[PDB]
């Protein structure tokens, strides 16, 4: 298990997300689905010139998995996935300059819902999650588990769990007062409102 410090700007962004009073929390789902959609476009694009890039799985989809017992909402995609370097590098983002453009916009009059326009939408997961686990598999690397409960640090370890083939799994360990995001009708309403034009099938799993 390797422990890393977030760059100062990212720690500030996460602290801003966690501590600012902002009721429109549901936007986290749109932001994670949009990242999944970009990762899927990336593997589809590479597959246009190299069909063997899809040897790790031909299905290009997004699964939403609520688990009331574990109090987790999992977003799974079969996108390009991430290497260890991408994971350490703010999960494939330009998060340092992205955070500065975002925080400058917030001072000007913008709101937290515009986070995705600054390429740091992943961090909106902390509007609803106390802990985020990212399981990822890229064709050019091994399977890794990224994890952070914020607090200025994140961990990275080789994942010896269930192999995924290729893609990313975002496990949101929801805050006690954010369990509405495990309800079928609430997830369905959010998907329909903010993600109606995503070019991949979005499957909302049901529970026992
Ligand atoms: O919630 C996420 C977060 C990241 C990924 C991901 N996997 N591979 C690549 S590239 N991305 C990616 C997407 C958008 C911006 C930056 C990125 F690094 C994902 O599939 C889901």
UniProtKB/Swiss-Prot annotation:
One GO location term (cellular component): sperm plasma membrane
UniProt: ATP binding residues: 35, 77, 96, 122
Principal localisation:
nucleus
**Result of altering residue 77 to A:** Impaired ATP-binding. Strong interaction with HIF1A, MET, KEAP1 and RHOBTB2. Loss of interaction with HSF1 and ERBB2. Los of interaction with TSC1
Q: Does the keyword Hydrolase apply?
A: yes
Post-translational modification remark: ISGylated.
The biological process GO terms on file are: activation of innate immune response; cardiac muscle cell apoptotic process; cellular response to heat; cellular response to virus; chaperone-mediated autophagy; chaperone-mediated protein complex assembly; mitochondrial transport; neurofibrillary tangle assembly
| Region Interaction with NR3C1, residue ranges | 1-208
Q: Where does the source fall among the domains of life?
A: Eukaryota
Q: Report the function annotation for this chain.
A: Molecular chaperone that promotes the maturation, structural maintenance and proper regulation of specific target proteins involved for instance in cell cycle control and signal transduction. Undergoes a functional cycle that is linked to its ATPase activity which is essential for its chaperone activity. This cycle probably induces conformational changes in the client proteins, thereby causing their activation. Interacts dynamically with various co-chaperones that modulate its substrate recognition, ATPase cycle and chaperone function.
Q: Report the family membership.
A: Belongs to the heat shock protein 90 family.
Identify this protein by name.
Heat shock protein HSP 90-alpha
- What organism is the protein native to? Homo sapiens (Human)
């Amino acid at each position: 298990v390797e422990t890393f410090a977030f760059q100062a700007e990212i720690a500030q962004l996460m602290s801003l997300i966690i501590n600012t009073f902002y009721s429109n929390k549901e936007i986290f789902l749109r932001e994670l689905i949009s990242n999944s959609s970009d990762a899927l476009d990336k593997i589809r694009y590479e597959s246009l010139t190299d069909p063997s890039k899809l040897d790790s799985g031909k299905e290009l989809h997004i699964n939403l998995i609520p688990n009331k017992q574990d109090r987790t909402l999992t977003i799974v995609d079969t996108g390009i996935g991430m290497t260890k370097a991408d994971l350490i590098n703010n999960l494939g983002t330009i998060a340092k300059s992205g955070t500065k453009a975002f925080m400058e916009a917030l001072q000007a009059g913008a709101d937290i819902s515009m986070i995705g326009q600054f390429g740091v939408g992943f961090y909106s997961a902390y509007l609803v999650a106390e802990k985020v686990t990212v399981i990822t598999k890229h064709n050019d690397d091994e399977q890794y588990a990224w994890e952070s409960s914020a607090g200025g640090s994140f961990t990275v370890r080789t994942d010896t769990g269930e192999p995924m083939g290729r893609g990313t799994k975002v496990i949101l360990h929801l805050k006690e007062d954010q369990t509405e995001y495990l309800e079928e009708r609430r997830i369905k309403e959010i998907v329909k409102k903010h993600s109606q034009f995503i070019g991949y099938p979005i499957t909302l799993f049901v529970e026992k």
